[PDB]
Design a protein around this ligand. Structure first.
Ligand SMILES: OC[C@H]1O[C@@H](O[C@H]2[C@H](O)[C@@H](O)[C@H](O[C@H]3[C@H](O)[C@@H](O)[C@H](O[C@H]4[C@H](O)[C@@H](O)[C@H](O)O[C@@H]4CO)O[C@@H]3CO)O[C@@H]2CO)[C@H](O)[C@@H](O)[C@@H]1O
Ligand code: CU
Length: 224
């Protein structure tokens, strides 16, 4: 359980953008059903909020996460797993992120040199999570997903046992990109509902074992 408080652009807090430029869900509840339409942008994913975060191709974006109160434990430390970041064109305001529209622009999972997960890193850095807007990205409005997966119950799956299974905590943010940018258009055209499966060994994952590495779900990060 956790969700996003606000977004920063090159070290600059844009200010609490919950229901302003973040499609904030009612609560910190997870997604578990792979079939669910909220897998993409969570349970108010399809409801537009009015403001966009104003950034540029190449800007360094920091998403701030919190559990109950801004600047608390961010997420129960049992919730160990990766942290992926995606991008899809803002096709129109009532898009809910479903369909074959997404491209992977960032990830972390399990670094075995340090035996630390992405979630370990996020707690340590106070719920701040950095990534970059590809330099060659084309101008105009996108949607930036970013999703924590907690694997403390992935030692079974939602379809076989529903009291457990992977837990998704996606947050979708509206972005208007300025500046010169480039030609590059995200064209990996990924679909959470089609593309995340219960047979995926990075979704049915026994984190309670002698394991050396973690297969991050979805495609590679996208080039240009
Ligand atoms: O399964 C084999 C493995 O189990 C290990 O223990 C696990 C449990 O399996 C797992 O169910 C448990 O999950 C907890 C979770 O850690 C808590 O953080 C969470 O709390 C939620 C709560 O649901 C909400 O009401 C509240 O608002 O939010 C908090 C989070 O912020 O509750 C779930 C269970 O409901 O995690 C255990 C790990 O500590 C054993 O340790 C291991 O030996 C076994 O091999
Ligand atoms: Cu939780």
């Amino acid at each position: 359980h956790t969700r996003m408080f606000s977004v920063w652009v090159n070290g600059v807090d844009q200010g609490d953008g919950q229901n302003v430029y973040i499609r904030t869900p009612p609560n910190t509840d997870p997604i578990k059903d792979l079939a669910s339409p909220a897998l993409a942008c969570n349970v108010k994913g399809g409801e537009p909020v009015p403001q966009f975060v104003s950034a540029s191709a190449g800007d360094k974006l920091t998403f701030e996460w919190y559990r109950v109160k801004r600047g608390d434990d961010i997420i129960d430390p049992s919730h160990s797993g990766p942290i992926t970041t995606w991008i899809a064109a803002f096709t129109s305001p009532t898009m809910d992120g479903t369909g074959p529209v997404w491209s992977k622009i960032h990830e972390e999972g399990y670094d075995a040199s340090t035996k630390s997960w992405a979630v370990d890193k996020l707690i340590a850095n106070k719920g701040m999570w950095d990534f970059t807007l590809p330099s060659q990205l084309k101008p105009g409005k996108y949607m930036l997903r970013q999703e924590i997966v907690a694997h403390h119950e992935s030692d079974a799956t939602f379809d076989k046992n529903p009291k457990r299974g992977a837990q998704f905590y996606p947050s979708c943010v509206q972005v208007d990109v300025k500046g010169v940018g480039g030609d590059a258009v995200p064209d990996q055209a990924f679909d959470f509902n089609k593309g995340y499966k219960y047979s995926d060994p990075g979704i049915a994952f026994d984190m309670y074992t002698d394991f050396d590495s973690y297969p991050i779900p979805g495609p590679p990060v996208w080039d240009a």
